[PDB]
Design an enzyme around this catalytic site. Structure first.
Site, PDB file in Angstrom:
ATOM      1  N   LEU A 142      12.680-131.480  50.089  1.00  0.00           N
ATOM      2  CA  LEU A 142      11.802-131.771  51.213  1.00  0.00           C
ATOM      3  C   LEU A 142      10.717-130.707  51.337  1.00  0.00           C
ATOM      4  O   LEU A 142      10.703-129.709  50.613  1.00  0.00           O
ATOM      5  CB  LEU A 142      12.601-131.860  52.515  1.00  0.00           C
ATOM      6  CG  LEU A 142      13.516-133.080  52.630  1.00  0.00           C
ATOM      7  CD1 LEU A 142      13.861-133.370  54.082  1.00  0.00           C
ATOM      8  CD2 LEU A 142      12.879-134.291  51.972  1.00  0.00           C
ATOM      9  N   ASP A 143       9.784-130.953  52.251  1.00  0.00           N
ATOM     10  CA  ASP A 143       8.725-129.999  52.527  1.00  0.00           C
ATOM     11  C   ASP A 143       9.020-129.236  53.819  1.00  0.00           C
ATOM     12  O   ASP A 143       9.922-129.580  54.585  1.00  0.00           O
ATOM     13  CB  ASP A 143       7.376-130.715  52.617  1.00  0.00           C
ATOM     14  N   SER A 144       8.250-128.168  54.048  1.00  0.00           N
ATOM     15  CA  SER A 144       8.358-127.439  55.308  1.00  0.00           C
ATOM     16  C   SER A 144       7.958-128.320  56.485  1.00  0.00           C
ATOM     17  O   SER A 144       8.593-128.279  57.548  1.00  0.00           O
ATOM     18  CB  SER A 144       7.493-126.181  55.259  1.00  0.00           C
TER      19      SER A 144
END
Ligand SMILES: CCCCCCCC/C=C\CCCCCCCC(=O)OC[C@H](COP(=O)(O)OCCN)OC(=O)CCCCCCC/C=C\CCCCCCCC
Ligand SMILES: CCCCCCCC/C=C\CCCCCCCC(=O)OC[C@H](COP(=O)(O)OCCN)OC(=O)CCCCCCC/C=C\CCCCCCCC
Ligand SMILES: CCCCCCCC/C=C\CCCCCCCC(=O)OC[C@H](COP(=O)(O)OCCN)OC(=O)CCCCCCC/C=C\CCCCCCCC
Ligand SMILES: CCCCCCCC/C=C\CCCCCCCC(=O)O[C@H](COC(=O)CCCCCCC/C=C/CCCCCCCC)COP(=O)(O)OCCN
Ligand SMILES: CCCCCCCCCCCC(=O)SCCNC(=O)CCNC(=O)[C@H](O)C(C)(C)COP(=O)(O)O
Lengths: 103, 459, 128, 178, 156, 88, 603
Positions: free
Chosen positions: F42-44
């Site tokens: 996932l991303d931040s």
């Protein structure tokens, strides 16, 4: 990002201690040891002790002490309308000037 | 009148011959008995006075002050019982002796048929309180506070002696009855102006007048609890009593000589009240509130109307009781925190709920909530000033507003919010302190039922 | 482009809109590091004194003592008579007094003149 | 709250906070859920365009005009959770929080009630008494010289050792005591 | 426990005593800034930012959560002015000058429009109300021994 | 109030339920111990949006410094349990 | 003899019994709230009788029972006035309070200090009764201060919250600003009329001057939260819901309008003061409606609605219609109390959530609250043949048919339109849309206490307006003939506001996002009145209180003049006098000099 390892161990230990302390916060069934020692019906006793006694005292006080002095209890003069009769004197108010009635 | 003086004098041999662990009990019991005896003086006449003898007399103005002075001593003893625990028996006996001497001097001061005797005792009262402040004082500034308190009053009162002896040499007597009955108008002359200034300044410096009030916050902060009690309740009223007695001979000069002082009070009662908004010390805040109230009393006395005089008397009594109560509360907090700062101990209602109730009642009384006698005096003086000039209300109104503010400030900072975490030596309130507060507050609400006892001789 | 926000004394500039925070130098990072260092040393000493079971009193705060002493008793020794202080004191201590005196003297003189002239209608004015 | 702060704020952390705050205020503006979702995906689309930007100068120049634009369109009455530092019940229960040490001042008649609780309380007191003596030495031997550089506390490393400075964190009154 | 030397003193004139005062107050020398050397007795005490206590970080674990202060940190001279129960200087969505201009304009326009409406009033196409017995002279005030000038009302 | 005393089981169940409603992450791949950046890629921004969804689900908002270092579901449940003082 | 006096005093007497029992054992049990509620219900049903007697005949009485003191020619005695206003307002207030306490027995079940809360509510009720029945200015001031201090105590119910404390202090501040004018009026009346008794004030003042009525108007504006001193009423929502519902929505606030009603014979003899009253009411109602238009918290919206209603009542006072204003007081009590009760029920059902953004479709999830709020909003907006009809319609009629300001007339018309608009806003954003609350559904109304309390006021808001209007004797000259367009102007502006508000709220579904307009921002921040007026003056006072008041004058110059100058002079003179080297040379030289000076000077 995330926790440093020291942070994870500290948080874990602190959380276990917090859960233990919070668990200690509960009460055993016998915990409140109360030491005993002494020396319509509700509505009726209420209406007697909370209405009848105050109104008796107030009526006595107003009837026999407040009214003993002049001008303490003074009353608005009752309205007089034509055609009425007065209990005290007995005269009757004469009627009005028979205004022309229409619609 | 000797039936009050003689037991007060006998209090001294009783204290000095008492057991090493029973001084407080007998002192309190017999002080309360003397107060009960002095309660008889409240029976007054619409005629002149109760002239007991050639040396003492009583009036409807001296009676409330005498009753308050006699009632004060048991409260002062209960307040001082705590912090003198580690004191030698001889020094405790000295402290009780100082309190008894101060009460005796005030008792014979408030009767005082003759003005020179009044001055003698009114200056004699300066010694026991000075010794109390400078000897049993916590801080190192107690010496400077004692010097200020002594020298302000002595500088004010030295010309009063010259004025009084000059009066006796010209008129022939200083007896108050002869002074009132043989009173004559004062001509508009420079000699009479300086006569007026000498006669007035001695009492106006002790009220204290705004600008001459520098001594009061010091003498209140550095004094022990009993010293603050006595100097806030009765010793401030000495100036008001003096002006009320002495103004009979200053007419009609006072009609225009009062202008410089009235302004100093009318503005001052505002300024000091604003000072109360920004204060880090409870004792300093209460001292400045006392200055504001006494400035209002000064205005009432200088107006010189019947309603002004009754309002001033009622305000004097109410302010004395409320100020003593507030100082008792502040000392109770200090004996727990030992800091005497406002922002350290917070959220005390969470810890001491009945003390929070006492704080609320004291603040409401200081706030002048009806139908308390505080508001009776305040309203009477406000109305009399309104009759004096319709503009005064503005200042008066502002002061009232500001008053409420700081009172609630003192209630909110100390009792509401979140408790300070690092103070954990807040023990539950003793029965002695709660009894002290109850004995402070119940007489106020009782006097509210019979105001005519504290409305002065002009009622 | 959007309308600019003008900060004032009573409405300060938001921390997110300060250009100073964007001007980053190693000196600024060093300053922030030593700021947090002194903050951490104070917090450490406070917590050490706070969590000790032996203490049963009030943690004496030197900052509070300094604040109170500076507010109360450090004014006069540091006070020097200057034209600014002299002028401000003269104004704020004499102007209001004479202004209120003038106002009340004018009011009372007008009232006295009306009383002497008889045109005041003081009927029912019994209590004074 | 629980986490110790850092000496400064990174650009990545700042841009995350701007995204969070802008998304919350946009949610406040768009009351309905579907409209909120539509404009939130639009916001993410306009947000990640400069994700792959490299140099520091342009990145710092960005996130500044964005902050100004947000300030102009910030919905001066945002939605705040009831327990938030601006909500309707931020400090409602702070008056029911009472310290533990007041129980040291209870009268023995009151202590007669709840005996098991107070026995456990003395057990906790003795545990704290030993653990503090251990913790002072652990902390003085652990701390770098010249004073701590951050307000982060080390955990326990031995067997019977407890985390330093734990008493006043574990024994919080409660969230809703009464 | 407080010694004589850590109490606030006179205004620093040399950089040595300036750094000493900064060390006394627990703040950086470069961050330290006393009040100007005028007659007012601010003296040694530091000129902290005039920011209010409300806008401090609400998530920091302060030692005094209600006042949002930390133990041992320098205290603002006017702390009692900003205690979150008094004046605060937190930023507002609209600039101060714009808000003042808008409210002043609204109130001034309101007063002017009220005065204009006073000048140009509103009423109904009717004549004055008629009262029988000489505009009710006897029941309004009285004076029955004067015989006022009679007023008769016009029937249409 | 009349609020039921929710437990650790309830909190974990809610967290996994809301996570499973996230289409970007596979229901089978996710675990109680599954990391977001590495175990799920996932991303931040994805993490901050997940924190947003948790805040909206449970009615209280997590401060940013505490949320930025909340990287896995088990520590999310632990943080929520510590914040709300739930026994078991 | 004459049970009117006995019953009227008995109601107030029995309203105080639980206060005396607060030290008894019942105060330490959980039965105290029921005890106080039963006492209030008995007081209401007892007070219903004197109102009936007045309705039959028109009985009015003054009771001067206890003589407090006498001050020369003035006499202060405990006197109660039991005229039409008192005997009509007492039953309404007791009914509203009974409903509020029954509701609070459910709302405040989890509060550890619930007995103290009921004790405080009863104390406020007693002080309000004292205020209403007072016959002299001192007793009225006693009640005036009692209601204010009780509001201060009840707003800061959660003393651990800073905002509650500052809101309570704000309320005290504004009420004291009004108290300035109240005290000015008292001083003027006792100086000139030589009495505080109402009868003497009425006799001796045929043409009342400007100053006492100015003071009374200032006091009424302060306590009723008019435009100059409005923000305290909306900020007073920090307190519990039951407190806001009774103290701030229907009872304590109407104190200023009631005071102006009490002195209506003197108000009608002054033409300038009536103009100021009308203008102040118009600005108050429009400003508060404008603020309420865009507010998002339900409690704040209803607070602004109450402020607008109070402004409308003051407008009625301005055009010389006091009995109509009293009737509107009576009606507003009913429907505003019900609206606050329904709002509080919704908040309790949504886990203490007040914002309308996070509450959606409750129309089917909680039907009784929906129908009660719908009926209350219909009555509030002037739906005909409802409780609010008989007051508001006559207000509109009388303001439209009087020699008054045109700006004021336009202002109240726009205010009515905005009232309809914000009622529609409440209904639309609280009951019609899709739900927006957290998944955990805890919605439940199935509690007989809440249902009964709501339904009692609901029956009231349906029938009491008709009953009271048909039972009271006529008090004003009616407006029989109207132009047709002016007759329906109230309904026309009502439906115009409804339609425009509904159209504007319908556009929020559109997938269009636009930044708010300048006019909208002004409305949200309440005209920026709370900002600057709570930042500029206070600061400019407090700084002076530290700079000029304490440091410059007290700590610097007053110390410089008397003490320091004397000390410096004495020290210098001592140094000069005592500084001798001990040489007899100079000593005898000075001896010779003074010898020659004495020889040559004094002879
Ligand atoms: C209770 C249980 C006992 C029941 C048996 C008693 C029944 C009633 C018999 C009482 C006899 C009447 C009586 O008490 O005497 C009258 C006597 C007055 O005495 P007077 O000298 O005539 O006038 C006052 C000036 N000196 O009346 C009373 O004392 C009792 C009634 C007083 C009213 C109650 C007062 C309560 C409020 C307290 C004061 C509040 C502050 C002041 C308010 C200011 C308002 C302007
Ligand atoms: C004349 C009045 C002069 C003003 C006196 C100022 C008093 C100074 C000390 C007050 C203490 C400071 C204080 O109370 O704190 C400010 C406090 C907190 O602000 P909040 O809005 O509640 O913020 C909460 C969200 N965080 O706000 C206040 O209560 C300050 C209110 C001051 C009001 C001053 C303005 C009054 C103007 C009156 C004009 C109208 C005249 C009458 C018109 C009526 C028609 C006849
Ligand atoms: C003509 C002559 C007029 C004489 C008037 C006498 C006024 C009474 C005060 C005299 C005291 C003067 C001495 C003095 O104070 O010295 C300054 C001294 C220096 O410090 P020391 O304590 O002495 O050092 C100790 C370590 N070695 O300063 C002080 O301490 C002052 C402390 C007490 C202050 C008292 C202030 C009294 C002034 C108030 C008004 C009284 C004025 C009376 C005259 C005014 C004219 C009507
Ligand atoms: C806080 C410190 C305040 C100290 C007191 C301030 C007030 C000072 C009062 C004046 C001082 C002298 C008072 C004299 C006593 C009154 C006696 C009197 O008035 O008799 C006059 C005498 O009046 C005088 O002689 C007074 C002269 C003043 C000499 C001393 C001056 C002291 C300083 C004066 C200015 C300050 C006064 C006000 C200060 C305010 C407080 C700061 C008439 O005497 P004959 O000569 O017989 O009549 C003439 C017709 N054949
Ligand atoms: C109504 C409210 C209006 C507010 C609107 C504000 C304007 C929005 C537009 C802002 C445009 C920008 O992003 S400004 C662009 C500034 N420059 C960069 O973003 C370059 C590197 N980006 C990062 O590092 C990020 O953190 C990222 C990699 C995305 C995340 O990483 P992770 O997650 O792996 O941690």
């Amino acid at each position: 990002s995330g926790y440093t390892p020291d942070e994870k161990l500290r948080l874990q230990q602190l959380r276990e201690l917090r859960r233990r302390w919070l668990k200690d916060q509960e009460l055993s069934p016998r915990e409140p040891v109360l030491p005993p020692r002494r020396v319509t019906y509700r509505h009726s006793i209420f209406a007697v002790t909370h209405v009848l006694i105050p109104v008796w005292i107030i009526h006595y006080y107003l009837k026999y002490h407040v009214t003993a002095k002049p001008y303490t209890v003074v009353e608005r003069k009752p309205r007089i309308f034509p055609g009425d009769t007065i209990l005290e004197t007995g005269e009757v108010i004469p009627l009005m000037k028979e205004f022309p009635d229409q619609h | 009148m000797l039936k009050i003086i003689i037991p007060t004098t006998m209090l001294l041999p009783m204290t000095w011959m008492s057991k090493h662990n029973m001084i407080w009990i007998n002192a309190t019991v017999h002080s309360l008995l003397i107060s009960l005896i002095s309660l008889s003086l409240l029976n007054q006449l619409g005629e002149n006075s109760l002239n007991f003898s050639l040396t003492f007399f009583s009036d409807s103005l001296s009676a409330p002050l005498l009753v308050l002075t006699t009632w004060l001593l048991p409260l002062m003893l209960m307040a001082s019982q705590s912090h003198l625990s580690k004191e030698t028996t001889t020094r405790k006996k000295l402290y009780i002796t100082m309190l008894i001497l101060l009460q005796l001097f005030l008792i014979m001061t408030f009767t005082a048929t003759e003005l020179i005797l009044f001055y003698i005792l009114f200056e004699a009262t300066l010694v026991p309180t000075l010794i109390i402040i400078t000897r049993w004082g916590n801080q190192t500034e107690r010496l400077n506070a004692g010097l200020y308190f002594l020298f302000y009053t002595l500088a004010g009162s030295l010309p009063l002696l010259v004025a009084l002896v000059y009066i006796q040499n010209t008129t022939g007597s200083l007896n108050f009855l002869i002074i009132h009955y043989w009173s004559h108008p004062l001509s508009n002359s420079w000699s009479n102006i300086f006569m007026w200034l000498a006669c007035i300044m001695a009492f106006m410096v002790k009220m204290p007048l705004y600008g001459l009030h520098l001594w009061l916050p010091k003498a209140h902060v550095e004094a022990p609890i009993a010293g603050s009690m006595v100097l806030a309740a009765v010793l401030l009223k000495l100036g008001g009593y003096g002006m009320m007695r002495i103004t009979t001979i200053l007419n009609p000069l006072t009609n225009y000589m009062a202008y410089p002082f009235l302004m100093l009070s009318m503005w001052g009662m505002i300024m000091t009240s604003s000072i109360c908004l920004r204060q880090t010390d409870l004792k300093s805040l209460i001292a400045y509130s006392s200055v504001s109230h006494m400035a209002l009393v000064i205005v009432a006395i200088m107006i010189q109307t019947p309603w002004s005089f009754m309002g001033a008397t009622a305000l004097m009594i109410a302010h004395g009781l409320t100020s003593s109560m507030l100082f008792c509360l502040a000392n109770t907090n200090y004996e727990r925190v030992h800091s005497r700062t406002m922002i350290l101990a917070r959220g005390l209602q969470t810890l001491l709920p009945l003390m929070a109730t006492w704080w609320l009642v004291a603040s409401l009384t200081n706030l002048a909530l009806p139908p308390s006698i505080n508001l009776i005096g305040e309203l009477f003086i406000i109305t009399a000033s309104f009759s004096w000039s319709n503009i005064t209300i503005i200042l008066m109104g502002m002061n009232m507003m500001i008053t409420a503010l700081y009172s609630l400030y003192m209630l909110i900072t100390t009792q509401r919010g979140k408790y300070t975490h690092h103070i954990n030596n807040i023990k539950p309130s003793f029965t002695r302190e709660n009894a002290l507060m109850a004995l402070h507050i119940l007489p106020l609400l009782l006097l509210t039922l019979n105001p005519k006892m504290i409305l002065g001789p002009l009622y | 482009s959007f309308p600019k926000y003008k900060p004032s004394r009573l409405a300060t500039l938001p921390a997110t809109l300060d250009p100073a925070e964007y001007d980053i130098s190693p000196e600024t990072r060093k300053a922030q590091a030593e700021r947090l260092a002194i903050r951490s040393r104070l917090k450490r000493e406070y917590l050490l004194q706070y969590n000790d079971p032996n203490r049963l009193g009030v943690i004496e705060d030197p900052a509070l003592i300094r604040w109170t002493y500076a507010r109360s008793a450090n004014i006069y020794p540091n006070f020097r008579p200057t034209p600014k202080t002299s002028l401000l004191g003269a104004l704020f201590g004499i102007g209001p007094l004479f202004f209120w005196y003038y106002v009340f003297k004018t009011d009372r003189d007008k009232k006295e003149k009306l009383i002497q002239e008889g045109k005041l209608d003081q009927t029912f004015n019994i209590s004074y | 709250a629980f986490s110790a702060p850092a000496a400064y704020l990174t650009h990545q952390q700042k841009v995350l906070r701007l995204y969070k705050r802008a998304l919350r205020h946009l949610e406040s503006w768009c009351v309905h859920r579907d409209k909120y979702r539509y404009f939130a995906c639009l916001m993410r689309a306009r947000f990640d365009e400069h994700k792959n930007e490299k140099d520091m100068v342009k990145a710092t120049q960005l996130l500044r005009q964005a902050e100004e634009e947000f300030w102009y369109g910030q919905h001066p009455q945002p939605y705040i959770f009831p327990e938030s530092p601006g909500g309707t019940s931020y400090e409602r229960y702070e008056c029911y929080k009472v310290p533990e040490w007041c129980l040291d001042d209870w009268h023995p008649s009151e202590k007669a009630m709840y005996p098991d609780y107070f026995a456990k309380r003395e057990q906790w007191k003795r545990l704290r008494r030993e653990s503090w003596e251990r913790e002072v030495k652990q902390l003085q031997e652990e701390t770098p010289p010249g004073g701590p550089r951050t307000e982060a506390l080390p955990p326990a490393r031995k067997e019977g050792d407890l985390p330093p400075l734990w008493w006043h964190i574990v024994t919080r009154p409660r969230e809703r005591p009464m | 426990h407080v010694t004589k030397d850590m109490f606030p003193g006179p205004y620093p004139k040399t950089p040595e005593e300036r750094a000493a005062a900064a060390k006394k107050y627990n703040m950086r020398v470069e961050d330290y800034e006393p009040y100007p050397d005028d007659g007012m007795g601010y003296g040694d005490y530091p000129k902290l930012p005039d920011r209010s206590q409300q806008e401090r970080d609400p998530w920091y674990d302060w030692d005094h959560p209600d006042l949002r202060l930390n133990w041992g940190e320098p205290i603002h001279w006017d702390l009692d002015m900003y205690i979150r129960n008094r004046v605060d200087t937190s930023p507002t969505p609209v600039s101060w000058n714009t808000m003042c201009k808008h409210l002043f304009g609204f109130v001034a326009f309101m007063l002017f429009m009220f005065w204009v409406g006073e000048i140009y009033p509103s009423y109904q196409p009717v004549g004055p109300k008629q009262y029988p017995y000489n505009d009710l002279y006897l029941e309004r005030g009285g004076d029955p021994t004067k015989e006022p000038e009679p007023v008769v009302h016009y029937e249409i | 109030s009349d609020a039921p005393p929710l437990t650790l089981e309830a909190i974990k169940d809610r967290v996994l339920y809301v996570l499973k409603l996230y289409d970007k992450i596979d229901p089978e791949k996710l675990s109680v111990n599954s990391h977001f950046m590495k175990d799920l890629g996932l991303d931040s921004l994805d993490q901050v949006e997940i924190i947003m969804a948790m805040e909206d689900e449970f009615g209280f908002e997590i401060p940013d410094i505490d949320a930025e270092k909340l990287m896995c579901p088990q520590e999310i449940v632990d943080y929520i349990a510590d914040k709300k003082d739930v026994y078991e | 003899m004459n049970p009117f006096a006995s019953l009227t005093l008995t109601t107030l007497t029995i309203l105080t019994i639980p206060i005396m029992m607060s030290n008894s054992n019942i105060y330490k049990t959980n039965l105290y709230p029921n005890y106080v509620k039963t006492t209030v219900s008995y007081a209401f049903t007892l007070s219903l009788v004197p109102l009936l007697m007045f309705m039959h005949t028109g009985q009015e009485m003054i009771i001067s029972n206890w003589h407090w003191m006498t001050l020369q020619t003035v006499e202060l005695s405990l006197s109660f006035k039991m005229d039409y206003f008192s005997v009509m307002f007492i039953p309404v207030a007791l009914f509203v309070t009974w409903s509020i306490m029954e509701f609070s027995m459910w709302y405040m079940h989890s509060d550890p200090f619930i007995n103290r809360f009921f004790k405080y509510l009863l104390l406020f009720l007693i002080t309000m009764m004292i205020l209403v029945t007072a016959n002299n200015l001192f007793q009225l001031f006693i009640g005036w201060e009692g209601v204010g201090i009780m509001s201060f105590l009840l707003i800061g119910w959660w003393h651990g919250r800073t905002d509650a404390n500052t809101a309570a202090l704000q309320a005290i501040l504004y009420n004291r600003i009004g108290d300035i004018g109240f005290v000015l009026s008292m001083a003027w009346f006792l100086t000139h009329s030589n009495a505080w008794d109402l009868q003497q004030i009425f006799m001796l003042n045929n043409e009342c001057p400007n100053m006492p009525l100015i003071g009374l108007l200032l006091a009424a504006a302060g306590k009723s939260a008019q435009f100059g001193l409005h923000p305290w009423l909306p900020s007073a929502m920090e307190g519990p819901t039951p407190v806001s519902a009774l103290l701030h929505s229907s009872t304590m606030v109407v104190a200023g309008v009631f005071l102006l009603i009490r002195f209506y014979p003197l108000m009608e003899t002054n033409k300038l003061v009536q103009t100021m009253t009308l203008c102040l009411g118009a600005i108050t109602t429009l400003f508060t409606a404008l603020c309420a238009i865009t507010q998002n918290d339900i409690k704040k919206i209803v607070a602004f609605s109450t402020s607008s209603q109070l402004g409308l009542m003051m407008v009625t006072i301005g055009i010389n219609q006091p009995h109509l204003a009293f009737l509107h007081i009576c009606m507003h009590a009913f429907f505003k109390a019900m609206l606050f009760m329904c709002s509080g029920s919704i908040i309790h059902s949504l886990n203490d959530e007040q914002d309308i953004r996070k509450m959606g479709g409750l129309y089917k999830a909680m039907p009784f609250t929906t129908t009660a709020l719908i009926i209350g909003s219909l009555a509030l907006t002037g739906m005909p043949y409802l409780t609010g009809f008989y007051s508001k319609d006559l207000i509109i009629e009388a303001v439209n048919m009087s020699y008054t300001n045109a700006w004021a007339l336009l202002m109240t018309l726009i205010a009515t339109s905005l009232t309809a608009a914000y009622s529609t806003r409440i209904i639309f954003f609280a009951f019609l849309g899709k739900p927006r609350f957290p998944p955990l559904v805890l919605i439940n109304e199935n509690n007989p206490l809440l249902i009964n309390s709501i339904k009692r006021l609901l029956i009231g808001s349906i029938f009491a307006g008709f009953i009271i209007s048909n039972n009271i004797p006529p008090m004003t000259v009616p407006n029989t003939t109207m132009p047709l367009y002016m007759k329906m102007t109230a309904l026309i502006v009502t439906i115009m506001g409804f339609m425009l508000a509904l159209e504007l709220n319908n556009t929020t579904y559109y997938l269009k996002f636009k930044y708010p307009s300048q006019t909208y921002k002004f409305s949200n921040m309440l005209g920026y009145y709370p900002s600057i007026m709570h930042r500029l003056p206070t600061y400019h006072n407090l700084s002076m209180s530290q700079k000029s008041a304490s440091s410059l004058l007290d700590l610097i110059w007053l110390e410089t003049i008397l003490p320091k100058t004397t000390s410096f002079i004495q020290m210098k003179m001592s140094i000069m006098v005592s500084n001798q080297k001990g040489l007899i040379k100079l000593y005898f030289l000075s001896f010779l000099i003074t010898i020659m000076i004495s020889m040559t000077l004094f002879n």
